[PDB]
Write an enzyme that holds these catalytic residues in place. Structure first.
Site, mmCIF file in Angstrom:
data_model
loop_
_atom_site.group_PDB
_atom_site.id
_atom_site.type_symbol
_atom_site.label_atom_id
_atom_site.label_comp_id
_atom_site.label_asym_id
_atom_site.label_seq_id
_atom_site.Cartn_x
_atom_site.Cartn_y
_atom_site.Cartn_z
ATOM 1 N N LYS A 1 -0.446 -1.282 8.506
ATOM 2 C CA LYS A 1 -0.810 -0.190 7.612
ATOM 3 C C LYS A 1 -0.586 -0.508 6.141
ATOM 4 C CE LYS A 1 1.680 3.181 9.132
ATOM 5 N NZ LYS A 1 2.545 2.476 10.112
ATOM 6 N N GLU B 1 8.698 3.346 1.245
ATOM 7 C CA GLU B 1 8.791 2.280 2.279
ATOM 8 C C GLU B 1 10.095 1.495 2.110
ATOM 9 O OE1 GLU B 1 5.613 -0.593 1.682
ATOM 10 O OE2 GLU B 1 5.996 -0.655 -0.480
ATOM 11 N N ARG B 2 10.324 0.490 2.962
ATOM 12 C CA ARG B 2 11.530 -0.371 2.825
ATOM 13 C C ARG B 2 11.711 -0.736 1.348
ATOM 14 N NH1 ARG B 2 8.084 -1.477 6.509
ATOM 15 N NH2 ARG B 2 8.588 -0.704 8.601
#
Ligand SMILES: Nc1ncnc2c1ncn2[C@@H]1O[C@H](COP(=O)(O)OP(=O)(O)OP(=O)(O)O)[C@@H](O)[C@H]1O
Ligand SMILES: Nc1ncnc2c1ncn2[C@@H]1O[C@H](COP(=O)(O)OP(=O)(O)O)[C@@H](O)[C@H]1O
Ligand SMILES: [Mg+2]
Ligand SMILES: [Mg+2]
Lengths: 463, 48, 489, 129, 463, 129
Positions: free
Chosen positions: A153, A179-180
């Protein structure tokens, strides 16, 4: 007036007020002596409101006082947020000093009416091969990516950002990607050196924050997108600001994490009782009114890799173009890993895309669907047994499955091969030639990460 | 021709037996899933 | 005071009211604001009540009063061509609706002795559902399938085809994105079908009460014409989202849970709504109108839509609703991707009314479709090796293939009775044995086009009358012979 | 560098503790905030910048970048990767290495599945050659 | 002495009385000023009765008076109920006038004793050929009917109703559980047309009614059937009566929904904790007593095509025979379309029915089995194959298939041909002759709708 | 010699009482104490010694050994011995007599499958002849 804390379990905190000064819903409150703020979630009578704390609840105990602001959490909106990174309450976290803006808007607001709904009429090229053919986009629309963990994604989201946002002028884009951290810190840095940080605003929250912060990140980004589109420069427009959120699922995950502590009974798989309305009240506000336009791209997580989960199933109705990623195609080596079947776009009509495009798309989907049903027969009886009219279908299906693959500009660190870009007309020409039976002598190993057809010819020659 | 017919009828018998077993497994799994979901829902409703 | 009540809880959209002794079930309440409310559960010491509107402006201590009036909606012939909410307020911004009279939203269907058999027919423009699965005035049939398999297209084409028939149509949308509703209304207005079409809308960002009480209001607006001796047709875009909203409301009342968390009474919810689509006798119409209308019957047609997950038709709500209707239309995802556009599965689709709901010509010509399709279903697997089969079976297989391809069509282009009859007669008589399988659609379209420009008067007689007579058969045969003699597809 | 022998046992212990303590149960008989439990731990592994080192050390050391690496271990039942917990942990880390029983008993050791195992850092964490 | 409503949630209604007088389980109460009567389903403390209403509860405030009947719901039963349509409590719904009967009986009655009923197997001769040959009934048995619409199920039911009165002087009772209103109207009008309505009673339970009504309607029909059984003719001899139940699957579902409404914990896979006990309460009372007999014909729905499901499993433990109606035979044009290979009985043994009957039935069954195994070959590659034995088997199978049909006395009016109540002995003799090979010369067209055996001969000599 | 006409129905009745007693359902079809309900019953059938007989009878009877034999019956659905109740009774009995239905419908009556029906004390009970 001022209240006191009477109970605290994890994130859920309920504060008891006076008889007549009970704060309304979503009336942020300030806890004196600490950097924590509370938002009202539900009323329980007796002068008790069960709230959720924004920030850690470590360092606090029962008995502490609280002051009611009697107003929702307001964020700074204006032209001065461009090029700045801020946490959910709007505090800058880029070590660049405060933000000079007086305009402020609440993050909780109603939805646009039926009267002020505008249609979408213009296509929007992206350069990807499968997306530009089986799932055309359109300005002012809504786009979603469906995938299970580890299927790509993000890479696709970064490629979309790099492929349209950097080129369109006056965009005034907005980034709500979550996100991370490693992936985030790199973005801010990458955006800067490219000198495009001028016309971009960012709101970012991590995974380690308590459920209070993870619950209300998307609303802040929506408020900053709404302000931009609505405004109009003299003799000018709202700049067609673009919104990209990489954190839609966490909204529902935090909701279901705290639903049980608010007393709500379990439902369905165990998802919260009010899943549908909670998803709708957020997914509606991302729209294009007659006074502006918004083009949004989302990332949708698929728990346990089944699409019948109540969380991703409810979101299908809210989108215009849907892109579905499959684990099996990823494990087979084909990138991007998008399921040609189960991916469709509302803009795929003979009146919008045209006549040739529609026939090409339908023929491709028909060939693949026919190939999807010949596996069991090949297994039980030999390949030789099936007629030649199905040998052609099998071989063309394999060739088509590899030809929808191309290398990306962004993902060169992994494979080490240079990136590529393909315009729509090349895609149409190549697929028309393929379904016609031409390129039937080229081995299927020359369609892998080769991009355009002439590159297919050259790569086949090299073999 | 006779040998081909022998192989085909053996394949038919194997397929029928496999269908029977798969149907049994499917019914067992369906009922078990319904029961487990009911137990989880009742436990959750009792906890609150 | 009996009227005076308080508020002790405002959470997730449901309000618990203290006091209010001697209240009523379903009786609306005031709420000290524009928004009003409904009294679903009457416990020992606190009345529960959902709120019809935005509940964010309700706080503890605010007051409420019992009106004494059951929820009612504006109903009449002036609602045609307008778009409203689930309470009857315009939203299209075209001015107020000149209401004339109202009616209750929760009523009971007519008794058994006050009904009549369904002989009057209803057309949909689809050769798939007008020769194999006929629908009649008063029948209730279901459209069921997966997501993105053309469930709404089929519902909308039925409304579009009710031009030149005098059947008022109603459209209900529950739990949809507002842009989709706007596009649907725009497409309805483009063709001119908005004149006889009423639209009730309840979008995703709308409290579950208005996504739960919408089909009842749609039915109440649809019942006005039936009691007056006129026909009507109603369509519910989704009953699954209504069921989800009902589940959410009940779970917030903590009513006993069940399979898939559903409350005790889910069968009753859809049964009482779907039993109100009925055909009334002339005596009932005369009694209701007090003699103002004589020798006329009425009829309400219902077309609910239900979405299933991954093809599982054994879930709770789909099984509840299948057992209630008089038929089922099954749409398959694999058929849609395979190229079958109307995508009906004729094998499992059923209609209990049967041939009693067709015109004479359609009923006469319908049998050759079912025979051919059944034979092709039985003989489908023999495609690979066919020379060994005798000539009769091969001919049956070819006829099955050609018929299966003829069953395809296009959205927003309903067929008329005359075109359907001409196509079915050409198929049954065998005039399309010559043509190639791939070019069936082109041949059919060209043949229909030629007739409507060359034999339009014959078509007019068929359309108004519908009777099939030796002369009509001879004329159809001669026209098809002429077209095959002199034309190029 | 830090190694966790098995985080599944930690998850079981947490479920025990949060059930003996009265907290409402959830999907798979597990409780709430298991994702938060496994995420607040793993995210503590990071590579700080030289400015962070200098500020923390109060100027004692300069021109140095800290680091911390983690290798948690999770076990599965019947060799499935589509289970809810395994995916919840996969979504947190920057990669995964999958070991297959069918490859182990077949003599392929160490049994590593190339298709299902990925690394998100990529070539950045490598030598030039 | 008088109660008052204290709670109203959907159907369930809790009513509170004095501590001394509390209505027993299953007793009925009436609310003054309205048409609703209440039924006791579960008894709680403080003199609080938890009841289920028998109608719609819209427009019902709390604090209303209720008067106790102190007896179960008693239905008016007698000879005046013949040819009437009545609802669950016995009020006419045909707008024809009140029933003249005064005597009334309760519907909740204890089961008969162990030695109260003494029975020896004794076949009930319907007069239909295929049923009396392959699936013989038994006075006091319970029969399961399999099949949907489009196979003339109602025609078979009407024929049985007519034949029982023609032969054994027996009245019949019809009970509908969750029936569609349209189908009920059609059935009533068609029975009026066919001059069968004079001998039957009717009790309807509609879908739009609350489950408390569709649950307790089988008992209402059963009470009337039992009263008809025990009406002593001169010189005793009681009477033989029938009972039709529209669908017992909906009976079990009504039980499941009621149990869910009262809050009982779910059992196994989504079924009421108490399911079997209830079906024994229903099915056991249909027995052959010393003074008379009650049979029963019931239609059964199998959920999800799963015979392992608890509902069909609880059902099949009480059945004595199964009649399977086939759509294929109906399409063939032979009526009735009763399947002669899938229908079974517990009386088709060499002992009870007689040896000759037993081997006759066995022989016709394996002949039909051979024809079923061979019809695929005969239909794919035709009859051009050369083998005398299987050709003879084919001809005999076709003759038997045609011979199984017979004209009924219900269609005389629409058909103009008379019915035939063929006695069993003639069927046995004709089938023995057909199996022997004596009638190997009669044309197969001479058996269609031809009644008994000899008639066939004349019909043949007519040609 | 004692014969139980059906033991599965006893299990169903016990389940009904337990569920009406508000006990938790559990993840299995039946509660977990069905096993002990059947075991406490099937354990009471055994042979005693002559000394126990004399001891209980106060010396009235001598040199005689008591006995008790059980022949319980268990009902299966579509020949599924893998269900909960059927497998609980198979594992606590000294033999099984498997009556099929395919043989019953084929005319072979009594229908006993010798392949899977076994006895444990067999060969000791049989007489010499
Ligand atoms: N007869 C047809 N021929 C060609 N395309 C069709 C046809 N019917 C539907 N479609 C296509 O199907 C899509 C629309 O699907 P549709 O909205 O009917 O499905 P749905 O998801 O069941 O509906 P909804 O969610 O609105 O109830 C469009 O791409 C449209 O072009
Ligand atoms: N275009 C591509 N080329 C090569 N590898 C890719 C590509 N897209 C995704 N991948 C691989 O798939 C993985 C998906 O990672 P990422 O997309 O960040 O996680 P998620 O899919 O959960 O968002 C990456 O680690 C990368 O190795
Ligand atoms: Mg992910
Ligand atoms: Mg849809």
């Amino acid at each position: 007036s001022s209240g006191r804390i009477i109970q605290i379990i994890g994130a859920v905190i309920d504060v008891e007020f006076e008889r007549t000064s009970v704060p309304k819903i979503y009336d942020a409150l300030q806890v004196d002596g600490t950097e924590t703020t509370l938002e009202v979630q539900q009323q329980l009578g007796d002068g008790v409101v069960r709230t959720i704390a924004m920030g850690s609840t470590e360092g606090l105990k029962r008995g502490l006082t609280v002051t009611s602001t009697n107003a929702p959490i307001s964020v700074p909106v204006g032209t001065a947020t461009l090029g700045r990174i801020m946490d959910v309450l709007g505090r800058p976290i880029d070590e660049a000093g405060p933000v000079a803006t007086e305009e402020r808007l609440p993050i909780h607001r109603q939805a646009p009416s039926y009267a002020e709904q505008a249609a979408s009429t213009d296509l929007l090229e992206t350069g990807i091969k499968v997306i530009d053919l089986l799932c055309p986009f359109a300005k002012g629309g809504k786009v979603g990516l469906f995938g299970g963990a580890g299927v790509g994604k993000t890479v696709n989201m970064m490629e979309l950002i790099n492929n349209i946002a950097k080129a369109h002028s006056g965009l005034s884009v907005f980034a709500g990607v979550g996100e991370r951290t490693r992936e985030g810190n790199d973005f801010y840095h990458e955006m800067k050196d490219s000198n495009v940080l001028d016309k971009v605003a960012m709101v970012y929250g991590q995974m380690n924050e308590p459920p209070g912060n993870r619950l209300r990140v998307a609303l802040t980004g929506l408020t900053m997108a709404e302000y931009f589109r609505d405004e109009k420069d003299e003799n000018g427009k709202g700049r067609d600001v673009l919104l990209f959120v990489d954190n839609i699922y966490r909204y529902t995950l935090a909701g279901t994490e705290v639903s049980a502590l608010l007393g709500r009974m379990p439902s369905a798989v165990g998802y919260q009782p009010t899943l549908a309305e909670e998803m709708g009240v957020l997914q509606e506000r991302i729209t294009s009114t007659k006074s502006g336009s918004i083009t949004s791209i989302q990332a949708v997580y698929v728990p346990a890799d089944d699409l019948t989960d109540p969380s991703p199933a409810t979101t299908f109705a809210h989108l215009d173009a849907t892109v579905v990623l499959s684990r099996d195609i990823a494990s087979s080596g084909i990138y991007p890993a998008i399921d040609p079947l189960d991916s469709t776009s509302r803009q795929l009509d003979p009146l919008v895309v045209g006549q040739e495009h529609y026939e090409i798309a339908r023929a491709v989907q028909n060939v693949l669907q026919r190939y999807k049903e010949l596996k069991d027969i090949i297994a039980i009886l030999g390949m030789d047994e099936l007629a030649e009219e199905d040998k052609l279908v099998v071989y063309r299906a394999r060739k088509i499955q590899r030809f929808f693959s191309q290398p990306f500009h962004v993902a060169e660190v992994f494979t080490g091969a240079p990136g590529k870009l393909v315009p729509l007309k090349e895609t149409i020409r190549g697929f028309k030639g393929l379904l016609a039976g031409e390129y039937d002598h080229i081995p299927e190993q020359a369609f892998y990460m080769v991009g355009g057809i002439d590159e297919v010819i050259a790569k086949a020659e090299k073999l | 021709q006779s040998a081909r017919m022998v192989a085909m009828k053996a394949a038919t018998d194997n397929a029928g037996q496999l269908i029977k077993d798969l149907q049994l497994i499917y019914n067992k799994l369906r009922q078990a899933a319904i029961t487990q979901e009911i137990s989880e829902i009742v436990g959750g409703a009792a906890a609150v | 005071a009996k009227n005076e009540g308080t508020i002790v809880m405002v959470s997730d959209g449901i309000v618990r009211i203290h006091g209010l002794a001697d209240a009523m079930y379903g009786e609306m309440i005031e709420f000290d604001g524009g928004l009003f409310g409904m009294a679903l559960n009457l416990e020992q010491d606190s009345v529960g009540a959902v709120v019809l509107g935005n509940y964010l402006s309700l706080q503890e201590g605010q007051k409420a009063r019992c009106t004494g009036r059951v929820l009612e909606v504006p109903v009449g012939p002036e609602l045609l061509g307008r778009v409203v909410d689930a309470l009857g307020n315009p939203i299209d911004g075209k001015g107020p609706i000149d209401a004339k009279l109202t009616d209750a939203v929760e009523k009971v269907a007519p008794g058994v002795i006050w009904r009549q058999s369904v002989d009057q027919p209803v057309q949909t423009g689809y050769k798939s559902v007008d020769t194999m699965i006929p629908v009649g005035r008063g029948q209730r049939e279901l459209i069921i399938g997966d997501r993105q398999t053309g469930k709404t297209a089929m519902a909308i084409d039925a409304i579009i085809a009710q031009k030149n028939s005098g059947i008022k149509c109603v459209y209900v949308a529950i739990g949809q994105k507002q842009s989709t509703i706007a596009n649907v209304v725009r497409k309805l207005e483009e063709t001119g079908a908005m004149a006889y079409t009423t639209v009730v809308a309840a979008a995703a960002a709308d409290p579950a009460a208005m996504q739960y009480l919408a089909p009842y209001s749609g039915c109440t607006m649809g019942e006005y014409f039936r009691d007056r001796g006129e026909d009507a047709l109603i369509i519910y875009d989704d009953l699954s989202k209504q069921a989800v909203a009902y589940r959410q409301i009940s779970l917030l009342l903590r009513r006993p849970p069940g399979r898939e968390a559903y409350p005790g009474d889910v069968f009753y919810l859809h049964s009482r709504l779907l039993e109100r689509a009925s055909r009334v006798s002339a005596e009932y119409v005369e009694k209701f109108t007090n003699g103002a209308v004589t020798g006329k019957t009425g009829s309400l047609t219902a077309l609910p839509i239900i979405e299933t997950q991954a093809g599982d038709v054994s879930a709770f709500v789909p099984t509840n609703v299948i057992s209630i209707t008089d038929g089922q239309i099954f749409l398959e995802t694999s058929l849609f991707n395979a190229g079958i556009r109307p995508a009906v599965n004729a094998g499992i689709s059923v209609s209990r009314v049967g041939g009693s709901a067709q015109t004479k010509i359609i009923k006469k010509l319908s049998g050759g479709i079912r025979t051919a399709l059944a034979q092709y279903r039985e003989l489908a697997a023999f495609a690979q090796f066919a020379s060994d089969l005798d000539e009769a079976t091969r001919k049956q297989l070819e006829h099955g293939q050609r018929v299966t391809e003829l069953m395809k069509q296009k959205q927003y282009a309903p067929y008329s009775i005359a075109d359907q009859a001409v196509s079915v007669y050409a198929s049954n008589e065998g005039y399309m044995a010559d043509v190639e399988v791939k070019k069936i659609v082109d041949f059919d379209a060209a043949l229909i086009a030629y007739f409507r420009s060359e034999y339009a008067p014959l078509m007019k007689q068929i359309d108004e009358t519908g009777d099939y007579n030796k002369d009509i058969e001879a004329a159809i045969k001669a026209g098809i012979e002429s077209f095959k003699a002199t034309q190029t597809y």
